[PDB]
């Protein structure tokens, strides 16, 4: 059908009563009105700012919106009160609407103290507003005491956005709202808060994870509940866990490297929430976030057709600033999206024709070659769409100087299809890891993936640490081996937690695993700290690990976050040694995220 994407601002900072608006929640009422909620922040801050929970209503499917109304009013005269960070939850069996939010007095989330007495100003309280009239009027309650089974949980907040009601299983009808808690150790954990009596009473489940933050849940085609979290430990990705007991408890937490994230809120929903258990439609999920590891920008919608196992489909909705976002399924088959563009709160509406996808996830393996060479790699399409595609094509996005081309056999319902990509890399290509994008194009929509082509770099998996002058292991993981794991977020760090640790120079040496012809080293600085950066350096090599040749290269690195090359005339070696002679501004320690060796495998 005709693609649809429209937006309109619902709140603009400085207009209609507040200098700052933040934190979106969106839902559709049983009668079909859309409700948008967000904080008004008179002093521009989260709790314990004297904030208010606001709401706008649309009775024409989102085309026009009503006046801004107060759900919960902050108070700037004694006694001070603030209400912040809304999450909507509709009980579709009773018609009741809930809006969860914090209730602050003296403390915000980090400063909250143990206790559950509503009158204690040093607790960050868990409140909920309830409406039995479609969100026209609200009653208010504090539920902290009901959802704090462990007295060491000193703080909590409901994750902003929208919670869910289970439709499947023995706990069908359960209302689930996610929280973050701070435990006695100071760790941030996720916990589902839920009601099996239509919101009359609430309790907490079992907490999960560490390094958690705002988190969301969604009911999968088979009833399991999938948890998708912001990572307060800042991996660059979303964290995921799954429950098979209706959100009471979850399994282990993993990093989902399909879902890059800059440590920011996000949303995940059923595309077809009324679909029956086990149906194809019941497996379809939509996800919204900032698709970036570094900045809150490049707002993207993703679609999965397999309960979140793969995300074949994606499309950018906001290339610029894009912070919190929340999705909801609309009665007309389209989707609403409430998000933060930097100026307040914006409402967008889109359909699946805009998203332009086909449910056909596909894989292409990573591959390594030398400059001057050609290689062919297999492509494997899993057609989840249920339809035949007679003329699929495969478009690749690689360096303009390379020759890359691909093809794929016709797609058949319920079948895998084969294809291939051929890559030719010209002589003289700079050694490096090159990410290549691939798009499966069809008249019924497109799917995408990426793969990495490594050109003229040795295999880190065959390498080991031959020696190192100093490494921290007591207070953090700064093992030397962290330079050869392929992961820019793990680093070697020299010893720092003892006073008598050495300063510069520092030194790390690699065993390449065998003799190779090599001609360079590439250094990557530690990504999240500035004061352990290598500056002046020398490189040496060896055939035996004891007698060193060089310096074969010398120089001074910059503060660039990207790999930096140090090159030297091609030579045979089994071992390579980096001597870090100084730090950029004279500090005592060295840290290195990654070392790669330019050479022939
Ligand atoms: O002392 C070396 C370690 O410093 C840690 O950072 C310190 C920071 O320099 C100091 O200003 C402070 O307030 O606490 C920080 C601890 O998080 C680095 O994180 C660590 O890796 C070492 O470099
Ligand atoms: Na690393």
From Swiss-Prot:
Origin superkingdom: Bacteria
Positions of BNR repeats: 56-67, 129-140, 193-204, 241-252, 302-313
GO BP terms, alphabetized: ganglioside catabolic process; oligosaccharide catabolic process
Active site: 46 (proton acceptor), 214 (nucleophile), 324 (nucleophile)
Name recorded for this polypeptide: Sialidase
Family from the record: Belongs to the glycosyl hydrolase 33 family.
Species this protein is from: Micromonospora viridifaciens
EC number: 3.2.1.18
Catalytic activity: Hydrolysis of alpha-(2->3)-, alpha-(2->6)-, alpha-(2->8)- glycosidic linkages of terminal sialic acid residues in oligosaccharides, glycoproteins, glycolipids, colominic acid and synthetic substrates
PANTHER family named in the record: EXO-ALPHA-SIALIDASE, SIALIDASE
GO molecular function, one term: exo-alpha-sialidase activity
SMART domains cross-referenced by the UniProt entry: FA58C (SM00231)
Induction description: By N-acetylneuraminic acid, colominic acid, and sialic acid.
Species lineage: Bacteria, Bacillati, Actinomycetota, Actinomycetes, Micromonosporales
CDD domains for the chain: FA58C, Sialidase_non-viral
Compartment annotation: Secreted
Location of the F5/8 type C domain: 450-600
UniProt keyword Signal, yes or no: yes
Main location: secreted
Binding, substrate: 22, 230
Protein role: To release sialic acids for use as carbon and energy sources for this non-pathogenic bacterium while in pathogenic microorganisms, sialidases have been suggested to be pathogenic factors.
Record bears the keyword Signal: yes
Class of enzymatic activity (EC top level): hydrolase
GO cellular component, one term: extracellular region
Alphabetized UniProt keyword annotations: Glycosidase, Hydrolase, Repeat, Secreted, Signal
